[PDB]
């Protein structure tokens, strides 16, 4: 269940369409939620949104409730590439739409100055914003991190097209990593085993770039960046967007869970750690605490019911 919306971009000089999925229970309180921005909305929103909602529903949600925003494309080669090139890594000319490359900076300015402000004005957001980009969308994610964009706390880069304008762009990326000292950011990379690489046909060049880059991040361990990568040998470039999101989003929010099987102070301290990791206050979801109190209340479960009440009162 989504809303279909439009925004006139004065920056990009065109109409921009997007889709919003509100979390179940949204209308029933003043709870503010995180926002997961999804690139390639037209292609990826349906399967990604349905997964995100499945993971957050039930009595034992695996991730918290989130607002989902799917961003639709107009000129993808312009908006998703951070640098300009007319050629593939082979030196051979890319398709005619390569003439438009190099506008990721401007597209990001649309997200931060036009889209996000509009979203945050319309809905109750909690200051935690996630960006999910697959393929070229991954370069938007890498470029947001590279340019120290303040909006996003966490990035999921699913089989990023790092081969694009390589070695030039990749070199800029590496140099940001070496400089390090990130503003409490998080990065997750899903790496697939695609047998092809654009410009080369049957080759592992695309894959090898991702694996080498992930290895360098791990080896350099820049300060202020939570990083994790997963290699999927049985996935392809396109098929990895679903499982990559699965594992990346579950990883991102794994420590938000409160296992009722434990004390009030343990929960406060755990959310303190999450607040410092995200670089923004993070408090347990009001809905989530109400369920726990219901699972306790309904099941006569210990002082736990009462620990959960005070804990609800703490963050009130």
Judged by the rule CB under 8 A, the positions of this chain that interact with a copy of itself are 46-47, 50-51, 53-55, 57-60, 62, 194-195, 201-202, 234-239, 242-243, 246, 250, 261, 299
Nearer to a copy of itself, 134 or 149 (CB): 134
Pairing type for strands 2-9 and 185-192 reads unpaired
Phi, psi of 229 (to 5 degrees): -130, 145
60 binds, among Cl ion, a copy of itself, none (CB under 5 to 8 A by kind): a copy of itself
Q: Which is nearer to a copy of itself, 122 or 238 (CB)?
A: 238
User: Residue 38 Cβ, how far from a copy of itself at the closest point, in Å?
Assistant: 14
The one of a copy of itself, Cl ion, none whose footprint includes residue 47, by CB under 5 to 8 A per kind, is a copy of itself
Among the listed residues 172, 268, 261, the one whose alpha carbon sits nearest the alpha carbon of residue 213: 172
In the complex, what is the shortest distance from the CB of residue 305 to a copy of itself, in angstroms, rounded to a whole number?
Answer: 14
Nearer to a copy of itself, 62 or 306 (CB): 62
Residue 170 burial class via C-beta count within 10 angstroms: exposed 0-12, middle 13-18, buried 19 and up: middle
246 interface partner picked from a copy of itself, Cl ion, none, CB below 5 to 8 A per type: a copy of itself
Looking at the Cβ atoms of 115 and 240, the one nearer to a copy of itself is 240
Cβ closer to a copy of itself: 51 or 170?
Answer: 51
DSSP 265-310: HHHHHHHHHHHHHHTS-----HHHHHHHHHHHHHTT-HHHHHHHHH
Q: Report d(CA 296, CA 289) in Å as an integer.
A: 10
Residue nearest to Cl ion (CB): 183
Q: What's the closest the beta carbon of residue 107 comes to a copy of itself, in angstroms? A: 25
Cβ proximity to Cl ion, 163 vs 182, nearer residue? 182
Q: How far is the CB of 30 from a copy of itself (least distance, A)?
A: 27
- Residue 299 touches which of Cl ion, a copy of itself, none (Cβ within 5-8 Å per kind): a copy of itself
**Residue 40 is encoded by which pair of tokens?**
């390639």
Short-list 131, 192, 135, 188, CA closest to 163 = 135
Nearest distance from residue 174's CB to a copy of itself, in Å?
30
Are 109 and 67 a contacting pair, CB within 8 Å?
A: no
**Which residues contact Cl ion (rule: CB under 5 A)?**
148, 182-183
Q: Using CB distances below 5 to 8 A depending on partner kind, what does residue 243 bind out of Cl ion, a copy of itself, none?
A: a copy of itself
Tell whether the torsion through CA atoms of 299, 301, 306 and 312 is positive or negative: negative
CB of 12 to a copy of itself, least distance (A): 29
Sequence-separated (6 or more) residues with CB below 8 Å from residue 303: none
Q: Which is nearer to a copy of itself, 55 or 217 (CB)?
A: 55
- CA-to-CA distance for 178 and 187, rounded, in angstroms? 15
CA 136, distance to chain mean position in Å, is: 14
Q: Residue 181 binds which one of a copy of itself, Cl ion, none, with CB within 5 to 8 A depending on kind?
A: none
Q: What residue 54 binds from a copy of itself, Cl ion, none (CB within 5 to 8 A, per partner kind)?
A: a copy of itself
End-to-end CA separation in angstroms for the chain:
29
């Amino acid at each position: 269940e989504y809303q279909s919306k439009r925004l006139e971009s004065r920056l990009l000089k065109e109409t921009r369409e997007y889709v919003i999925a509100l979390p179940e229970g949204y209308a029933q309180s003043l709870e503010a939620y995180p926002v997961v921005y999804l690139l390639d909305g037209e292609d990826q929103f349906d399967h990604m949104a349905s997964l995100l909602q499945f993971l957050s529903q039930g009595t034992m949600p695996q991730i918290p409730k989130v607002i989902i925003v799917g961003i639709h494309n107009t000129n993808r080669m312009r908006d998703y590439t951070p640098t300009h090139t007319l050629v593939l890594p082979s030196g051979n000319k890319g398709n005619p739409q390569y003439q438009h490359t190099g506008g990721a900076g401007r597209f990001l300015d649309f997200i931060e100055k036009e889209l996000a402000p509009s979203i945050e004005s319309q809905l109750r957001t909690n200051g935690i914003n996630v960006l999910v980009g697959h393929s070229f969308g991954g370069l938007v994610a890498m470029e947001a991190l590279r340019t120290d964009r303040p909006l996003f706390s966490a990035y999921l880069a699913l089989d990023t097209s790092l081969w694009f304008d390589s070695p030039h762009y990749l070199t800029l990326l590496e140099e940001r990593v070496v400089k390090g000292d990130f503003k409490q950011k998080q990065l997750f990379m899903a790496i697939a085993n695609n047998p092809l690489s654009p410009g080369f046909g049957v080759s592992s060049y695309h894959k090898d770039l991702n694996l080498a880059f992930a290895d360098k991040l791990t080896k350099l361990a820049p300060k202020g960046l939570g990083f994790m990568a997963k290699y999927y040998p049985e996935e392809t470039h396109q098929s990895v967007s679903h499982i990559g999101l699965y594992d990346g989003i579950r990883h991102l929010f794994k420590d938000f869970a409160i296992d009722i099987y434990f004390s009030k102070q343990q929960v406060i301290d755990q959310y303190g750690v999450l607040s410092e990791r995200f670089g923004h206050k993070v408090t347990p979801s009001q809905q989530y605490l109400e369920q726990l109190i219901q699972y306790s209340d309904r099941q006569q479960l210990t002082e736990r019911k009462q620990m959960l009440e005070g804990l609800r009162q703490h963050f009130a």
